[PDB]
Amino acid sequence: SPTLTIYSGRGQSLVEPLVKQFEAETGIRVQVRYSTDAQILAALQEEGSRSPADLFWANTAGALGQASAKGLLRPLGETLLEKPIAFVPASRTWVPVTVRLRVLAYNPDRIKAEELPESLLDLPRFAREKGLVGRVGWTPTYSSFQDMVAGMIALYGEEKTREWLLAMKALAPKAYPSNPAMLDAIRAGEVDLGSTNHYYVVRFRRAGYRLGMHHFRDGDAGNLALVTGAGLLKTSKNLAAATRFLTYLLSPQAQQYFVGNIGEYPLVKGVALDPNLLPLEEALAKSPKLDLEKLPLDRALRLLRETGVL
Numbered sequence: 324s325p326t327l328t329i330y331s332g333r334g335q336s337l338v339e340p341l342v343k344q345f346e347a348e349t350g351i352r353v354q355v356r357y358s359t360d361a362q363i364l365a366a367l368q369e370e371g372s373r374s375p376a377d378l379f380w381a382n383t384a385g386a387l388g389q390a391s392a393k394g395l396l397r398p399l400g401e402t403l404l405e406k407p408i409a410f411v412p413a414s415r416t417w418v419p420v421t422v423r424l425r426v427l428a429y430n431p432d433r434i435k436a437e438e439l440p441e442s443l444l445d446l447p448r449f450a451r452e453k454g455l456v457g458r459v460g461w462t463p464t465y466s467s468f469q470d471m472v473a474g475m476i477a478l479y480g481e482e483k484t485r486e487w488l489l490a491m492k493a494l495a496p497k498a499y500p501s502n503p504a505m506l507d508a509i510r511a512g513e514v515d516l517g518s519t520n521h522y523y524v525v526r527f528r529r530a531g532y533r534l535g536m537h538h539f540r541d542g543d544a545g546n547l548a549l550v551t552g553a554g555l556l557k558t559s560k561n562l563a564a565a566t567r568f569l570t571y572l573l574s575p576q577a578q579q580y581f582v583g584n585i586g587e588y589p590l591v592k593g594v595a596l597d598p599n600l601l602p603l604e605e606a607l608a609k610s611p612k613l614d615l616e617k618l619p620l621d622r623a624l625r626l627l628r629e630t631g632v633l
């Protein structure tokens with residue numbers, strides 16, 4: 324009955340097999356609550372000391388930054404934090420697990436690569452000029468998108484970001500509950516382009532589907548490299564098991580699963596990608612350089628609600 328309990332902002336169909344493999348191998352029984360990083364953060368404030376969660380497995384670093392800032396997370400040890408090749412938070416209150424890259428997905432039959440803008444800030448302009456009203460997709464409830472927006476606040480300021488949002492909103496974009504839904508809509512011709520995580524494109528392609536992937540100019544907000552991670556909650560009474568699961572997330576077999584099954588980039592050195600994938604270092608070079616746990620995620624959510632996007 325005393326059971327390791329995980330609040331996960333990561334998608335169930337993506338990570339459940341990994342949880343199942345962990346239970347099967349360690350004998351530790353895991354109970355996972357699948358939500359979004361934002362609802363999870365809300366639940367932990369509401370629950371306070373009564374929280375049953377041992378671990379917050381977040382879909383984005385910003386969310387772990389929030390939880391840390393709210394004093395919700397325990398310090399982690401050197402052993403755990405020495406494994407990831409980058410992105411360890413200065414607060415040392417959570418561990419990065421995978422990295423993913425924001426990209427622009429598009430239908431190549433509808434859009435020519437050469438005409439796409441070099442900056443995400445110019446997307447509304449471009450969409451206006453090509454008459455793409457109602458033909459732009461986005462994912463307002465997806466935490467990586469929310470972190471991208473926090474990223475814009477950090478890079479361009481709240482003012483520019485709000486105005487980008489409002490300009491996107493004027494194009495009457497369609498909102499998708501999931502990234503795969505959006506990518507289906509792109510292929511189907513319901514929308515022509517959308518901002519997403521690279522691994523969703525990778526998975527779409529592996530399944531035999533063709534789809535364009537566009538990078539903005541090095542350093543652009545629209546190329547943000549983000550990280551998943553996990554943090555141990557101070558309220559936890561399952562510390563040993565929760566630490567074990569964190570260790571498991573950085574294990575060869577977990578890391579191999581993330582890259583081979585999910586298509587994201589691993590954070591432990593030595594676990595290899597297929598030759599046909601955009602290499603990790605080229606991917607990182609495209610991104611701004613930011614302290615990820617310092618991303619103003621809360622401000623981004625506030626801004627997304629203010630503007631009516633969320």
Ligand SMILES: [Fe+3]
Pocket residue numbers: 334520
């Ligand atoms: Fe995802």
